[PDB]
Amino acid sequence: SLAKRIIAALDVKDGRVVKGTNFENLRDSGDPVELGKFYSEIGIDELVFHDHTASVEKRKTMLELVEKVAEQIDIPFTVGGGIHDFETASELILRGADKVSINTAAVENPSLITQIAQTFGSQAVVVAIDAKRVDGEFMVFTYSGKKNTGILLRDWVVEVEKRGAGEILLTSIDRDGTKSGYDTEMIRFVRPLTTLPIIASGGAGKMEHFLEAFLAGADAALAASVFHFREIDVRELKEYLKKHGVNVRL
């Protein structure tokens, strides 16, 4: 079967992991570089950094983060959060990020997808799509889930691939922040609309949820606090998935 990836997402602010971790073994349990290096060592396939830093120091903070990370880890990583134009994306890729995540900026300027892909290849462009049900239809939301765009998920997925995106990071606002499981209905809805890899995001709670997400058609599964507060062990997760027929790297 098709190759699947386990992705750890690290929400960061001022070079600090937001709300820390339970990892006692680390010298600093809130250091995103050490946490990221540890995750790569215990079998995480890729990292996603999402920065929430204040606008004045954001650019410097994200560039310093990226440089420190690229130095310490040998697995691919994505950086995102408030990337609004090409020069911001370019700086981050050149400083060490393999991929950039764009969302609000992509919705408001779809050609930003094409602009980044044109210089760094489609594989450097992750379009994050935050979606939820509104009157029985999947709608795209921008500004950290605050704005209903009125654009159907069906339409945006197709457009995103057309513009030259390499991957879709699909977050279900309906499941994000809960531990009730991935939005497998949403993943199944998106799967036949695109040839791109789909990263399942939002709702991870136990190892079985990852199996369900991969059966739904996801090419990767992303989670944060379940890994950070050690509710799921990464090595146990991969062993479990491999046992039940998922093609994960051990």
Number of domains in the chain: 1
Known catalytic membership, residue 11: yes
Query: What CATH code is carried by the domain that includes residue 76?
Result: 3.20.20.70
Q: Which of 11, 31, 45, 183 is catalytic?
A: 11
To the query of whether residue 14 is one of the catalytic residues in this protein, the response is: no
Q: Do 27 and 33 touch, CB atoms closer than 8 A?
A: no
DSSP labels, 43-107 = T--EEEEEE---HHHHHHHHHHHHHHHHHH--S-EEEESS--SHHHHHHHHHHT-SEEEESHHHH
Q: What b/e sequence results for 168-193 when a residue is b if at least 16 CB atoms lie within 10 Å of its CB, and e otherwise?
A: bbbbbbbbeeeeebbbbebbebbeeb
Entry resolution (Å)? 2.1
Catalytic residue, candidates 31, 45, 51, 130:
130
In contact, 32 and 38? CB cutoff 8 Å:
no
Q: Which of 60, 159, 39 is nearest to 111 (CA)?
A: 159
Output the DSSP codes for 3-24.
EEEEEEEEEEETTEETT----T
Domain that holds residue 29: 3-248
Only one residue has tokens 């497998």, namely 184
